[PDB]
Amino acid sequence: KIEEGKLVIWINGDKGYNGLAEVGKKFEKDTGIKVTVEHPDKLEEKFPQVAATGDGPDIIFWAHDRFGGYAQSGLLAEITPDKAFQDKLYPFTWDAVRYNGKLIAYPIAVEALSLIYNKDLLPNPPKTWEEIPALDKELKAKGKSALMFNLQEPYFTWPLIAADGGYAFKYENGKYDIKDVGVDNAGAKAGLTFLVDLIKNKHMNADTDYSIAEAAFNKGETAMTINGPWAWSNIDTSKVNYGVTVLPTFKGQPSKPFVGVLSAGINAASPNKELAKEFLENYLLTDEGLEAVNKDKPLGAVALKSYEEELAKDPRIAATMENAQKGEIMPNIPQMSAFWYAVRTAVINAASGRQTVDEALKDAQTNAAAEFSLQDQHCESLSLASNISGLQCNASVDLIGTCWPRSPAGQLVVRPCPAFFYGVRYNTTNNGYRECLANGSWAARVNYSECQEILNE
């Protein structure tokens, strides 16, 4: 458990943490409270793993789209800023952090991906995606490359996939339809087909991650990169003469990046709740506070009206806003992470040719919509027919495909042993045993010691 009398904050390592550290350093010699800022790898997934065990940081910075999930697991306190404080920020940023009626975080900044290009290597930037393959074949000559960006994270490839009709969840009569998923329609299919083709013809390498693309652009090896306002800082230091511009169109349609609002949540387990509120409202979300972070790594447009009034003239902020305009603010519904993971997997499996586009994307449809396997359905039909009173274990299938049907609590359940002729599973004459516990959980212990064939296999 986190201790009382300090503040532990987590932010992504691509953001201006050292800028945030100074705000906490100003906070420290003002109230007398130690603020230590960290930036763990895989933060957005690490937070729920530590939190639910009452162990996270006090405050957490991530784009708003993950917050609905956190809120549903009960990891976030609901924030209580007065009407005076709410007026200091843009209404739409508040919408982004509003979940099931309640405000669940403080909005900080509006992020959108932009096309970044090298002016010395590329006077005029391409307007269409279709002309980049033609462009890279010219840059073959001078040992340079047209375009590299993070192909590991579907945030970067989504703008292309969304362009021609692909979407996450259908919005419908003031709500998202979590079963209606635009991940393998004609539009999404086209977009990825096009991406996959850039790698086949060797215009990009499927193993290109964030820091590979970053290093390539900033040293002058590549002509373009796709990135957000945080990236700018290092590019300045590099002294590369760069432009920030509207993302290329695909099939005459604009790229549609998913816009994120950087946001700060309060750990529901954290005792230091008022102290956390004290920090964000009075120290971070201020001209000074936000300026300090922005200097370190640019935030984009900021949620605080007053300080946004300052940054507005920056042509690069304009470009961010032009792209954000073409795209959309992400939903914050708890299914967003199932969506992201689906697309993350689709893109990588296709990127490496483990799957075709259509296989990769039909899988993504499955994944994103939280749909039931055939195996799931088969197993659930095993008890539906006969009725039990009281606590029950839900049907589930274990990692060797044994179906443990819905069963009464506190009972031993007997199922046929698995065996496999090559890929073909079948059931033997022997049995495996598993207890359904008094509390409706399946026991971790599964006795397979009589399963003669599988032991031999």
Ligand X SMILES: OC[C@H]1O[C@H](O[C@H]2[C@H](O)[C@@H](O)[C@@H](O)O[C@@H]2CO)[C@H](O)[C@@H](O)[C@@H]1O
- What residues line the site for ligand X (CB under 6 A)? 12, 14, 44, 63, 65-66, 111, 153-155, 260, 340
CB of 152 to ligand X, least distance (A): 8
Phi, psi for residue 443 in degrees, rounded to 5: -60, 145
* CB-based closest residue to ligand X: 63
Q: Which amino acid is at 38?
A: E
Q: How far is the CB of 149 from ligand X (least distance, A)?
A: 11
As given in the structure block, the two tokens for residue 17 are 């943490």
Min dist CB 34 to ligand X, Å, is: 26
User: Quick one: 350 or 413, whose CB is closer to ligand X?
Assistant: 350
**Whose Cβ is closer to ligand X: residue 158's or residue 404's?**
158
What is the C-alpha to C-alpha distance for residues 305 and 89, in angstroms, rounded to an integer?
Answer: 5
Nearer to ligand X, 182 or 260 (CB): 260
Nearer to ligand X, 130 or 153 (CB): 153
SS3 content of the chain, % helix, strand, coil (to 5): 40, 25, 35
**Least distance in angstroms from the C-beta of 261 to ligand X:** 9
Q: Quick one: 14 or 398, whose CB is closer to ligand X?
A: 14
Q: Which is nearer to ligand X, 154 or 327 (CB)?
A: 154
Q: Provide the minimum distance between the beta carbon of 263 and ligand X in the complex, in angstroms, as a whole number.
A: 10
Q: Of the two residues 338 and 391, which places its CB atom closer to ligand X in the complex?
A: 338
Q: Which is nearer to ligand X, 51 or 135 (CB)?
A: 51
Is residue 357 within 8 Å of residue 189, measured between CB atoms?
yes
Minimum CB separation of residue 218 from ligand X in Å reads 17
Of 12 and 114, the one with the shorter C-beta distance to ligand X is: 12
Q: How far is the CB of 194 from ligand X (least distance, A)?
A: 19
Task: Give me the least distance between CB of 330 and ligand X, in Å please.
Answer: 7
Strands 59-63 and 98-99: unpaired
CB-hemisphere CA count at 13 Å for 379? 19
User: Judged by CB, which is closer to ligand X: 204, or 226?
Assistant: 226
Min dist. Cβ of residue 347 to ligand X (A)? 10
In whole angstroms, how close is the CB of 44 to ligand X at the nearest point? 6
